[PDB]
Amino acid sequence: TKGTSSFGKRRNKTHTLCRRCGSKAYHLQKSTCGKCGYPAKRKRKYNWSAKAKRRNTTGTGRMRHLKIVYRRFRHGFREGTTPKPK
C-alpha cells in the first residue's frame, strides 16, 4: 500500500513561501529556507549548482538601483547641478 493508497494521506504542508526569496521552500518546522537559507544573514549559494546561481544572481531581477548607478557613473556621479535653463 506504499503507492496509490499512501498518496491520499498527504495533506500537511512542509514548506511555505519564504519572505526573503519568495520561493515555496521555507521549511515550517525548521524555520529555514531550503533555497536562500533564511533566516541566515548570508544568502545560500553553492558552486556545485551554476544553473541555480544564474537563476537568482544580479541582473535576473529588477536592478532598481544598480541600473541608475550605471547611468550616473557615465557622468561622474555629478550632484547638485542642473542643465542650463532655457
Contact residues for another protein (CB under 8 A)? 16-17, 24, 69, 77, 79-80
How many residues are recorded in the chain?
A: 86
**The entry of RNA, Zn ion, another protein, none that residue 30 binds, CB within 5 to 8 Å by partner kind:** none
Please state the closest distance from residue 27 (CB atom) to Mg ion, in A.
8
Q: Are strands 32-33 and 26-27 parallel, antiparallel or unpaired?
A: antiparallel
Query: What's the CA gap between 35 and 22, in Å, rounded?
Result: 9
Interface segment toward Zn ion; rule CB under 5 A; list 8-16, 34-42, 62-70, 75-83: 34-42
Does the protein bind RNA through residue 57 (CB under 7 A)? yes
Q: Which amino acid is at 53?
A: K
Residue at 23: amino acid letter: S
